[PDB]
Amino acid sequence: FNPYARGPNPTAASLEASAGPFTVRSFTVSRPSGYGAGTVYYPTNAGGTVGAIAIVPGYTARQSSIKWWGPRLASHGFVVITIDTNSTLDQPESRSSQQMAALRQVASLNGTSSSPIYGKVDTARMGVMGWSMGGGGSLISAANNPSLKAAAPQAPWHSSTNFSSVTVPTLIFACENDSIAPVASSALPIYDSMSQNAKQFLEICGGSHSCANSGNSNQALIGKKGVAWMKRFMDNDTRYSTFACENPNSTAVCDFRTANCS
Numbered sequence: 258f259n260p261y262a263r264g265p266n267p268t269a270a271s272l273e274a275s276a277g278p279f280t281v282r283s284f285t286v287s288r289p290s291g292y293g294a295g296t297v298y299y300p301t302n303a304g305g306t307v308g309a310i311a312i313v314p315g316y317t318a319r320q321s322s323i324k325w326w327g328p329r330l331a332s333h334g335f336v337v338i339t340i341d342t343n344s345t346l347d348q349p350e351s352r353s354s355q356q357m358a359a360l361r362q363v364a365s366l367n368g369t370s371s372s373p374i375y376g377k378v379d380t381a382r383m384g385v386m387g388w389s390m391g392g393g394g395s396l397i398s399a400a401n402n403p404s405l406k407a408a409a410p411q412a413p414w415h416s417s418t419n420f421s422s423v424t425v426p427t428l429i430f431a432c433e434n435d436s437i438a439p440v441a442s443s444a445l446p447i448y449d450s451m452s453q454n455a456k457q458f459l460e461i462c463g464g465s466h467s468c469a470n471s472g473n474s475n476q477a478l479i480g481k482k483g484v485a486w487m488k489r490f491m492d493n494d495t496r497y498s499t500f501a502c503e504n505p506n507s508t509a510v511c512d513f514r515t516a517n518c519s
């Protein structure tokens with residue numbers, strides 16, 4: 258028996274749906290501690306403590322760019338914080354620090370009797386996501402904090418592609434037609450650098466740099482993969498092993514790679 262398993266046995270249809278099995282509520286963080294602002298999404302009815310995921314936007318961008326992940330993930334049994342950075346022009350290292358400050362504050366709110374997430378969080382089970390420089394920051398977070406259970410950045414950018422130190426299970430979303438952080442010089446080299454981990458590469462056909470953002474036309478596939486990855490690795494939930502590891506057989510997938518996935 259897996260003490261972290263939540264929710265019904267998954268299906269393709271249940272993971273491609275706009276909403277998971279749990280009812281979601283949200284709040285604005287009242288006093289953001291070490292980052293600009295944040296929104297916490299949480300399930301009201303998960304039936305046990307859940308892991309936490311912190312999601313960071315790209316350069317110039319705000320929560321709106323990554324907000325669709327909050328309800329999508331929380332509805333499957335996660336506490337999700339979407340942040341604004343101290344500056345829209347923060348670089349990846351700063352974004353990583355702020356992402357981890359957001360996870361810290363979620364852990365603090367677990368212990369805060371006034372918070373809607375009082376006693377809802379397993380602080381030992383955490384995940385990192387983000388777009389562009391926030392995706393680079395997620396990879397920095399993973400490199401610096403190997404106790405993180407999963408990473409799933411989208412269209413990442415970092416001034417270095419070498420993440421050979423990362424031992425955290427890492428899914429990279431990439432966008433075929435990205436001209437900001439081209440796949441061939443950013444996402445794919447970042448993927449190829451990682452030698453120690455479970456990892457996956459999923460490139461979306463015809464995608465611009467914003468192909469995994471709020472308002473994308475591939476929420477069925479991208480949401481299925483992001484939830485499956487986080488369930489598999491944050492919850493050690495092998496019910497999700499096939500959904501996490503499979504080549505999905507979608508018209509939307511223009512490049513796929515996976516390694517050390519079980």
Ligand SMILES: *[C@@H]1O[C@H](CO)[C@@H](O)[C@H](O)[C@H]1NC(C)=O
Binds near residue numbers: 290292351352354355
């Ligand atoms: C973000 O700003 C807060 C001040 O509100 C500060 O505590 C934190 O250090 C800043 N983080 C970075 C990485 O600059």
Ligand SMILES: *[C@@H]1O[C@H](CO)[C@@H](O)[C@H](O)[C@H]1NC(C)=O
Binds near residue numbers: 306368376
């Ligand atoms: C969060 O608090 C609840 C109860 O108030 C507790 O059961 C749980 O273990 C806490 N999370 C962590 C990681 O300690």
Ligand SMILES: *[C@@H]1O[C@H](CO)[C@@H](O)[C@H](O)[C@H]1NC(C)=O
Binds near residue numbers: 419420421449450
């Ligand atoms: C990344 O950095 C490590 C540590 O220096 C080095 O051994 C390795 O060759 C580099 N990886 C790539 C893919 O360049």
Ligand SMILES: *[C@@H]1O[C@H](CO)[C@@H](O)[C@H](O)[C@H]1NC(C)=O
Binds near residue numbers: 506507
């Ligand atoms: C992949 O999906 C298409 C679209 O529905 C389907 O026609 C095809 O038979 C599928 N591939 C496999 C493995 O069956």
